[PDB]
Enzyme design. Sequence first.
Site, PDB file in Angstrom:
ATOM      1  N   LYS A  48      46.790  33.429  31.980  1.00  0.00           N
ATOM      2  CA  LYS A  48      45.805  32.868  32.895  1.00  0.00           C
ATOM      3  C   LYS A  48      46.432  32.542  34.248  1.00  0.00           C
ATOM      4  O   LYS A  48      45.835  32.800  35.298  1.00  0.00           O
ATOM      5  CB  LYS A  48      45.162  31.614  32.305  1.00  0.00           C
ATOM      6  N   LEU A  51      47.089  35.717  36.347  1.00  0.00           N
ATOM      7  CA  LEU A  51      45.832  36.235  36.887  1.00  0.00           C
ATOM      8  C   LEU A  51      45.271  35.320  37.971  1.00  0.00           C
ATOM      9  O   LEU A  51      44.707  35.800  38.965  1.00  0.00           O
ATOM     10  CB  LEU A  51      44.810  36.425  35.770  1.00  0.00           C
ATOM     11  N   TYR A  52      45.407  34.006  37.793  1.00  0.00           N
ATOM     12  CA  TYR A  52      45.025  33.059  38.830  1.00  0.00           C
ATOM     13  C   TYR A  52      45.701  33.406  40.146  1.00  0.00           C
ATOM     14  O   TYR A  52      45.057  33.453  41.197  1.00  0.00           O
ATOM     15  CB  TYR A  52      45.418  31.647  38.402  1.00  0.00           C
ATOM     16  N   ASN A  53      47.012  33.622  40.105  1.00  0.00           N
ATOM     17  CA  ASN A  53      47.749  33.922  41.330  1.00  0.00           C
ATOM     18  C   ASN A  53      47.325  35.254  41.916  1.00  0.00           C
ATOM     19  O   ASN A  53      47.147  35.371  43.135  1.00  0.00           O
ATOM     20  CB  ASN A  53      49.238  33.912  41.047  1.00  0.00           C
ATOM     21  N   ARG A  56      43.756  34.852  43.553  1.00  0.00           N
ATOM     22  CA  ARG A  56      43.821  34.164  44.844  1.00  0.00           C
ATOM     23  C   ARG A  56      44.462  35.049  45.905  1.00  0.00           C
ATOM     24  O   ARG A  56      44.009  35.081  47.055  1.00  0.00           O
ATOM     25  CB  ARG A  56      44.594  32.848  44.690  1.00  0.00           C
TER      26      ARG A  56
END
Lengths: 141, 134
Positions: A48, A51-53, A56
Amino acid sequence: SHMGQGGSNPKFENIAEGLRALLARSHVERTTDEGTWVAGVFVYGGSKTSLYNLRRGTALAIPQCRLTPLSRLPFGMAPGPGPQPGPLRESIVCYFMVFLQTHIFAEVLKDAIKDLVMTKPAPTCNIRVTVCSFDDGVDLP
Amino acid sequence: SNPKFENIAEGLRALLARSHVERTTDEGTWVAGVFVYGGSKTSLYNLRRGTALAIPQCRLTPLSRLPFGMAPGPGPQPGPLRESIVCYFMVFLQTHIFAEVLKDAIKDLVMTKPAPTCNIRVTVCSFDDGVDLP
Ligand SMILES: O=C(O)c1cncc(C#Cc2ccccc2)c1
């Protein structure tokens, strides 16, 4: 290139820079006069946080795209246990989608993500990506 | 136990029963799908529950949110991460031929219902390299 306090940038800023460098190699259309959302990139796996990075950083690098939030994938063959019907059961693997106006830019972005994450340590290098197409487009609001 | 979801599943099954196309492949890969959005959060949720019951061969995402599209005028465009109040879910499928059948069935199902259910929209989608669902 810019460096933040103490000689480091956040991971999502470095993703944006890496994507910008790779995308600069391909001078392809990103928009159409029709403006329909007919293509996309489906990004999943890793973790997670990775994928967050990436999500963004993709947003920062590419104003011409639109992104879903992070969400979760169902299982494939032989779903895990749960009180709900199998098709609904959620894995711990996350995903997000990028919507795009052209098929070629989806291909270029898919290749850029693949090339970029291969330079990162696990679990980021385990991120998977495929182009997708929407037959009738998606009428984003 | 859930008559609402079972009624939706029965309506979908009745529409799907008119087609006999293959829903699975020996490869077992998730190469097509239906992208379902709009209506309302709750009506989409209910449709998702009915679809799970009517189609054991599919896999479903949770509901999530759509970003915005283009803004008219010369003003600022929305940033790529901005989220709207419009929701979606994805149906993963092993054949494109059945994706087309399901898209037609959902369109026919929801148009028999009052708003907001009848405002649900659907398109077939395809994944060039497939999705390796875990
Ligand atoms: O009430 C909701 O939220 C809702 C959402 N999505 C689909 C339906 C239906 C149907 C349906 C249509 C014909 C026969 C039987 C059932 C209902």
